[PDB]
Amino acid sequence: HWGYGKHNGPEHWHKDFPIAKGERQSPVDIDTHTAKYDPSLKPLSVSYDQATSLRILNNGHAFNVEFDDSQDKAVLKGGPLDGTYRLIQFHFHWGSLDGQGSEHTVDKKKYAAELHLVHWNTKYGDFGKAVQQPDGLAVLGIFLKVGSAKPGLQKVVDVLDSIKTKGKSADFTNFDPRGLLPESLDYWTYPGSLTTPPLLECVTWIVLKEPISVSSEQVLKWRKLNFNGEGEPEELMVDNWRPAQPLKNREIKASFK
Ligand SMILES: [Zn+2]
Numbered sequence: 001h002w003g004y005g006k007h008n009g010p011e012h013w014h015k016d017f018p019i020a021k022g023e024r025q026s027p028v029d030i031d032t033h034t035a036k037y038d039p040s041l042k043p044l045s046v047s048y049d050q051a052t053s054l055r056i057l058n059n060g061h062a063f064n065v066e067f068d069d070s071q072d073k074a075v076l077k078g079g080p081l082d083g084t085y086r087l088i089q090f091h092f093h094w095g096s097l098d099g100q101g102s103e104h105t106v107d108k109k110k111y112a113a114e115l116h117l118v119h120w121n122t123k124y125g126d127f128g129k130a131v132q133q134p135d136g137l138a139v140l141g142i143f144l145k146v147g148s149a150k151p152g153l154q155k156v157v158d159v160l161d162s163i164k165t166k167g168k169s170a171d172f173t174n175f176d177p178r179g180l181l182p183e184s185l186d187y188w189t190y191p192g193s194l195t196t197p198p199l200l201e202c203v204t205w206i207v208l209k210e211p212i213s214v215s216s217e218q219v220l221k222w223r224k225l226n227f228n229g230e231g232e233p234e235e236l237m238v239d240n241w242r243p244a245q246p247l248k249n250r251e252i253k254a255s256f257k
Helices: 010-015 151-163 216-222
Strands: 044-047 053-058 063-067 075-078 085-094 113-121 137-146 169-171 187-192 203-208 212-214
Touching: 053 151, 063 151, 075 113, 085 137, 085 216, 137 216, 151 169, 151 216
Parallel strands: 137 203, 137 212
Antiparallel strands: 044 075, 053 063, 053 169, 063 085, 075 085, 085 113, 113 137, 187 203
16 A cells, blocks of 8 residues: 555655646745735634544554544644634654655755645535535644643653554554644645645645754654564654645745735
């Protein structure tokens, strides 16, 4: 099945998922000089005060911190969005080395990792129905660089020992995702896709300009996770990122300056 290895990585995905070569695939390189300021864009509204995390899961390609999305609690709205999008999970993509890991790039610069907070459009009722719509998802992307530790991340880092391998999950309540946000909500936005199979073209991407800093020790623990299941040969969960895809007929808009 698909993955990030030599024989099943991103260059192979199109064989099972032909939309891989589609017209609005993600991630993309963000050329900061060609992104146009759009003064009609609104400030992003990130309302996570009532967010209720439930669980953390190693799904064999990343770890997802999952939220109770059965009510309107943690919601993203405003910015480029029409309507209300509910937080369902977040996860990260990271590298084997600090010089790579992000999916989006900024003037070809790769960050050490990238956080994706995934939200679905409430007008479609559930996530499964939402991914079938061109405006079904809003994903907030945040870049990570290695430097000072992110205090708000440590609770995630410390539970990873209990979900080392594919298919393991652990209770993970009362995690506050506001602790993962940078100071500024300045962003770029463009229409795109899921960056993992099925690669559905259902995402409004909102990528924050300001990265957060995590420590070397923090990202080191991510690199000890496994793609494989328990009792299988060990493959470290690293370089779980899709590279930049062709922009094609799309414009990236900036919320700022
Ligand atoms: Zn992702």
